[PDB]
Each structure stands twice: as C-alpha cells, then as structure tokens.
C-alpha cells in the first residue's frame, strides 16, 4: 500500500552552534580549534642550531660559551633560558632589534677587519671570560694604553665593506669601576669615541662608577652596532675606553628564530612553534598560544568550535 521516505539518526548526537541556535544536535561534527601540543621542537629536515648556554648576541662577540657558534648556519635557531650573551658583565644597545636580525639571518659568516695597532696594548683579558685562565671576547680586542696611567693616543681606524651584502659591525665601550681605574687603563682626560657611516652618526663618552658585582665583577661593557652597506666605509675615532672589533659578521640567508624550554626532536616535522613545543595541525584555528610563530593556525580565545558534518539529529 505505501512507500516511506526518511533519514538516518542516532539516539544521541553532537551539539553545535548555528546563527539561530546554541547547542543543536547533529549527526556528526568535527573540531576546528587545535588544542593538541607536541611538547618538543619538531625539527625534522631542518638545519637546526640549539644555542643552549650561548646567547644569540654572543655569537657576534664570542664569549667562551659561544665559541662553537661563531660562524653557525641554520634554518631554525633556538634560544634557551640559560643562554647568556656576555662573559664580562655588559649589555647591548638596541639589543632586541639585533636579535630579530640574527634570528632570521640563516646564521653568520665572519671576516677579518684588518685593523692594525701601534702605540697601544691590545690583549686585555679578565677572570670572567674563562678559557683555561683569563681571556676575552673572541671577536673583540680590549684596547688599552701601553702602560699604567699612560696616554691613549687619539686614533682613527677605517673599514670599507667590499662585499655585496650589509656588514654587521660591533664595538664596545668599557665603563671601569672607578674614575681612577679609567685613568689607569687609558690615561686621564674625558675620552670620546665617534662613529660614522653614510646613514649613521653617533658619539660615545664613557661613565666610570660602581655597579653591583655581576660574575664577581663591578665593571661593565656597553656593546653597540650598525649595518654597514656594500661599498660604504665606517670610521672609528677614539681616545680610549674602546673594545675593538676584530671581525665583521655577514648574514648567510634565511632562518626562523624561536625561544623554547623543550627538547629538539628530528622525528616529527612542524612549522608552528611556541615555547612549550610544536603545533602540528591542519585546522584553521588554535587555542594553545597566541605568541606561536612560524606558519600557524590563527590563535583564538575559544577552546572549541565544532563544525557540523552531518544533518540535524532527530531521534525517535
């Protein structure tokens, strides 16, 4: 007598939201917000450099913890909490700009400045910088006066960038513990260091005085930098208190830089990283970490957003 039409159903369905309604039950649904973290840096197939105790900015100056990173090469650069940029207490002027440059550099290649010195000492070391006895930043030279209290002769040194890419140049200003200890090292009088590239003009007068003991030492070194263009020249006029660059750094290509406290893992591949590991997902959204970097799903505040993949569930 009759033929009936109908559709499939479950007794119990999956709740979703629509334009009109909260929590309507459908036959099937799928998650659109990723919550699964891999607690590891997934670096399969990527030239990876884990800096460990070496600070990223330390790769340009060369404290002992960074001796194996002076000319590194990488697609992925991992900074660690224990990493330190310095041996002898100090810090970088404009530090985070330089980090951002180095994170995406693809690593660094180093080259001799060609500076030659006459009338001054050039081998100043310290107990903070340890390589079987006292040492100093590998890429730098602590310039001094020939003898104690002696005059530091006003000096001019120049470096032309003869290569096709920008040269990262770094120099340091030493701030000694006393007004006396500045005079001991570089002689009396107020000392002046100046720097000039086509698109750069700045000057540096020191400031002796007592800072608290870091690494057992109350002295500080300021570090500065500029990017010297192809064919441009940079001149260092200095009367003392100067940490001279021995080498110049050039950037190799491209890379991605991350900060993390989890282990490296060459068994999983991923392009979305945060400090707690890797987000591996094809979902368009993620609720794991808003500061995730690389190629990531978009961060959203919602924990979950289910997308209906079936009809409305209408049980008997």
């Amino acid at each position: 007598d009759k033929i009936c039409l109908g559709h499939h159903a479950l007794s119990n369905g999956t709740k979703v939201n629509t334009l009109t309604e909260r929590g309507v039950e459908v036959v099937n649904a799928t998650e659109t917000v990723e919550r699964t973290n891999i607690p590891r840096i997934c670096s399969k197939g990527k030239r990876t450099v884990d800096l460990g105790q070496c600070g990223l900015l330390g790769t340009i100056t060369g404290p002992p913890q960074c001796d194996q990173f002076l000319e590194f090469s990488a697609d992925l650069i991992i900074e660690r909490r224990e990493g330190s940029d310095v041996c002898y207490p100090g810090k970088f002027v404009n530090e985070e700009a330089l980090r951002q440059i180095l994170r995406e550099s693809g690593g660094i290649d180093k080259e001799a400045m060609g500076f030659t010195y006459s009338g001054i000492r050039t081998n100043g070391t310290t107990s903070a910088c340890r390589r079987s006895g006292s040492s100093f930043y590998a890429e730098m030279k602590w310039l001094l006066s020939n003898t104690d209290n002696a005059a530091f002769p006003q000096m001019t040194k120049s470096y032309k960038n003869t290569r096709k890419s920008p040269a990262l140049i770094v120099w340091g200003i030493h701030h000694s513990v006393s007004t006396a200890e500045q005079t001991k090292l570089y002689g009396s009088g107020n000392k002046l260091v100046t720097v000039g590239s086509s698109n750069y003009q700045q000057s540096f007068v020191p400031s002796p005085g007592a800072r608290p003991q870091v690494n057992g030492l109350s002295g500080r070194i300021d570090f500065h930098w500029l990017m010297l263009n192809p064919n441009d020249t940079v001149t260092f006029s200095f009367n003392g208190a100067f940490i001279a660059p021995d080498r110049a750094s050039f950037l190799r290509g491209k890379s991605m830089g991350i900060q993390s406290g989890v282990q490296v893992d060459a068994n999983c591949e991923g392009d979305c990283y945060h400090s707690g590991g890797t987000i591996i997902s094809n979902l368009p959204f993620q609720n794991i970490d808003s500061r995730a970097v690389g190629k990531c799903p978009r961060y959203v505040k919602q924990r979950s957003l289910l997308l209906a993949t079936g009809m409305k569930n209408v049980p008997e």
Partner: protein
C-alpha cells in the same frame, strides 16, 4: 531547516538506517523493507566534504617573534605590541565563531534540502498512481510488490503501466 523536511513534516529519523543518509522504507503484501538512496546521500556527503577541504587549509604566511619571553622588551613598545595582538585575537575569535555558525546553519539547511529534493523526485515518478500522506509517506493505490518498489528506488518505475488501476482506486 529552511525546507521543512528534516524535523518538519518527517516527524523523525531512522536509527535503523545505517546504509546511507537518506532512504526508503516500504510496506506491502510481501512485508516491510528498508534501503538507502545512494544519489541523495552522495550529493550531501560531497557538498559537506567540500566544505571541510575549504576550511582545512595551509596558511603559508610565516610570522616572526616581535617580543621576548626571556628579556622583556621596552615597556612602551611592548604595550603597543600586546594591544595589537589582542586586537587581532579579537578579530579571529569573531571570525571563527561566525564562520562556524554560518557554516552549520548552511549544512543543516543543505541536508534538509536534499531530503526535500528526494521526496519531490519520487512524487513526480508516481505521477497519478499515488497520493501524499503528509508524514513523508506515499500511499500507493495499485498493487506494488518488492520488484515494483525497486523500480521506484532505481528510477525505472513506469507510471503509465499501473495508471488506470490506481486511477480507478481513487
């Protein structure tokens, strides 16, 4: 949904129907039987999987760090960055909520729609040999055996064959 079939004039679904999304449940002299309509099921599945492929997609846009979790950046620039990121979070959280709601509304209307299309296809096949019950069933006025039911399901049913007998039984 908008087409009034699912959770509309069809009172409920069949938990027995594991074969497909839509189907027929006939009744006759030889007894009850149930079978799935492939074509309707496949049209809904394909449309829905095409939604999925659209949303499961690779953002090939790389973003880098602009602040620092170990060495806090200068506070002023840090607050501009946080404000900007929070503003962007607000935008995507909104986009994701609207996207899924809009898509879910459409999925439900689309499944409802396929049910309606199937229902109307059969009405047209059984031109004057059947009448419309109202609950999603067709009362057939001529004798239609299991062989005859398969003809309807497979789109081979000939209305002019059984017309006069069903016409007279009006």
């Amino acid at each position: 949904g908008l087409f009034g079939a699912i959770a509309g004039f069809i009172e409920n679904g069949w938990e027995g129907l594991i074969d497909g999304w839509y189907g027929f449940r006939h009744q006759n002299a030889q007894g009850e039987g149930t079978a799935a309509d492939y074509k309707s099921t496949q049209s809904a599945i394909d449309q829905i999987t095409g939604k999925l492929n659209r949303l499961i997609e690779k953002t090939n846009q790389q973003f880098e760090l602009i602040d620092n979790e170990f060495n806090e950046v200068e506070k002023q620039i840090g607050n501009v960055i946080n404000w900007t990121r929070d503003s962007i979070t607000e935008v995507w959280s909104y986009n994701a909520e609207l996207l899924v709601a809009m898509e879910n509304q459409h999925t439900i209307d689309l499944a409802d729609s396929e049910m309606d299309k199937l229902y109307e296809r059969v009405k047209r096949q059984l031109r004057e040999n059947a009448e419309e019950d109202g609950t999603g069933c067709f009362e057939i006025f001529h004798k239609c055996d299991d062989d005859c039911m398969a003809s309807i399901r497979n789109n081979t049913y000939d209305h002019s064959k059984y017309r006069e007998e069903a016409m007279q039984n009006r």
